[PDB]
Symmetry: C3
């Protein structure tokens, strides 16, 4: 077990290893209940190729145990073809030599800043979860998620947003997750409330 | 593997170990397909603190492999705050010193008597599954379940109840799961039918 | 880990071992992320008894990691009885001696030809997935699936069919998955398109 206690996770930066995984600051993962370091959470991601899709995780993300990000696009499976069998990849069989490569990229998988991901939540290829979004446990994300949206379910569907639309708009504008640490510590007292408007002022002020 | 065969489970009483887990008689768990004893089914449950929420399981429960009961309330994550990041818990960072503890208990998780839980069913913090309830496999229970309700799905939703409302009412009144063993063996022939009304009489009689 | 790379699966024929598992040609499974060979994907399947239900997999199936086929019917759990507790199986307890066997078979689980099963998809007892069907990941299949249906979700529900009804009808008639290899290689160029009608002609012709 890469982890010592169910109550102690480790930084992404201190455990990520596949070059095609770009994690941000302070984002962490706690997988004591799945025992593997964060690298194995990225399924089918080639550490070799620069040609593949990449998993990108924003800053300040708290990631639950056993989360999984399915990669490698279709894996050479074309549902619109007469057969979903990856003939092209089945080398040995000489008969399958003429097979064309049905593989298709899907685009980098992007997880925004401050995304709270539930244990065992699974993300399909190419999704883009927005900042602040909250992914429920066991949630199977099959599409893009909006900033500050609370989703959950198989398939995952938005249940509501964390703040008002205005609130959100303000949060998106001050982007505290990009704030110099000194200011994050400064505004700390306000980051522990739901007073977006207050925070917004404290921001506008400091900016001067 | 704590288990010898996919077809042989062990008593909760003979494997539970966290002091904050109170299992009842005859309730059993079979986790050959997940290999760990029942203690690891309670996620994030502190065996140390008397201050935490507890997992309580009634009598005569049959629990499928890999079931999981997510504990520790919010784990210090406040979705209504400007940030869902557990700053307070991120010690090292001196900047995060002023952070307030966003943690919140959720209440004991209660699983009634005779609850049949499917393999890999996952229960969220603070739910209360009622007696007789049947939890489908892979079912993600996010709220209270009623006695004799058959649920399933992500999110889990009642599909129907096992018996009539009257039937249920009778079952709830005689509470066979609390019956002295001699009477359980006695009424055995009737516990293997759907004749609640018959059982109810056999009960009323013996009571005299 | 029975598997060497997340990108390299093995034939069912080269790893199946329970006698009650009948896999077809070219069908493969890649479980690097679950590390166990295909035999453990069949949950509660007795390799001993000829009396039990069997798991049957067609030809040309691509099976994702950690897929699972729940077997053993009800496992002796009768929801329509007053108790869902498998008394009959709880030997030790002499009191439970009179218990009747609530067990019930459910019928072989049949997975058709060319079924593409997503990682961690779980099939309940007795379902029958039709040829060409596509099972989404994490999909919990609780009932029969039609040929060329694309399902997903907990519970799994058809999202749409891969081809037209006519298209389907043609595909079902030529059954390429039963074609002598020489013809499969022959028609290879067409098996890599969505031109069912074209394929159908190429077929009708060769037949002469």
């Amino acid at each position: 077990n890469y982890f010592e206690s169910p109550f102690r996770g480790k930084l992404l930066s201190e455990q990520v290893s596949n070059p095609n995984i770009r994690v941000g600051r302070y984002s962490y993962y706690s997988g004591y209940y799945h025992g593997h370091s964060f690298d194995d959470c990225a399924r089918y991601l080639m550490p070799d190729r620069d040609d593949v899709d990449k998993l990108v995780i924003g800053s300040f993300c708290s990631i639950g145990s056993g989360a999984a990000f399915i990669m490698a696009g279709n894996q050479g499976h074309r549902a619109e073809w007469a057969s979903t069998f990856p003939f092209h990849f089945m080398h040995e069989e000489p008969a399958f030599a003429g097979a064309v490569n049905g593989y298709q990229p899907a685009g980098d998988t992007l997880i925004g800043h401050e995304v709270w991901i539930g244990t065992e939540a699974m993300f399909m290829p190419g999704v883009r979860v927005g900042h602040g979004a909250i992914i429920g446990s066991r949630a199977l994300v099959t599409g893009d998620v909006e900033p500050y949206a609370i989703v959950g379910g198989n398939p995952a569907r938005t249940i509501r947003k964390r703040f008002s639309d205005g609130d959100i708009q303000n949060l998106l504008e001050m982007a505290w997750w990009d704030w110099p640490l000194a200011d994050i510590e400064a505004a700390m007292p306000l980051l522990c409330t739901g007073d977006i408007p207050a925070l917004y002022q404290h921001w506008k002020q400091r900016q001067a």
